[PDB]
Amino acid sequence: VDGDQCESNPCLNGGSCKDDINSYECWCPFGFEGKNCEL
Amino acid sequence: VDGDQCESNPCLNGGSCKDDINSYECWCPFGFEGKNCEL
Ligand SMILES: [Ca+2]
Numbered sequence: 268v269d270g271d272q273c274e275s276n277p278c279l280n281g282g283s284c285k286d287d288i289n290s291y292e293c294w295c296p297f298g299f300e301g302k303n304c305e306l
Numbered sequence: 307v308d309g310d311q312c313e314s315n316p317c318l319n320g321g322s323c324k325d326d327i328n329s330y331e332c333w334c335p336f337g338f339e340g341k342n343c344e345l
């Protein structure tokens with residue numbers, strides 16, 4: 268089944284990665300935004 | 307704001323880089339150590 272899309276640490280800047288099905292979400296610290304916390 | 311300090315792949319020897327705020331961390335394979343898995 269689907270693997271772990273967080274294994275590559277896609278979330279920058281201390282963001283917490285949650286694995287989804289063929290995708291991932293980043294939970295960013297306050298005041299970082301963007302899909303990977305890059306803003 | 308803060309950039310991706312994993313730019314340029316600082317972790318050696320198969321290590322995995324995680325971007326933090328103004329810093330990065332490496333996970334290193336068993337048998338390797340140092341900040342950048344260089345020891
Ligand atoms: Ca997945």
Ligand SMILES: [Ca+2]
Pocket residue numbers: 314315316
């Ligand atoms: Ca390099």
Ligand SMILES: [Ca+2]
Pocket residue numbers: 279280308309310311325326327328329
């Ligand atoms: Ca960073």
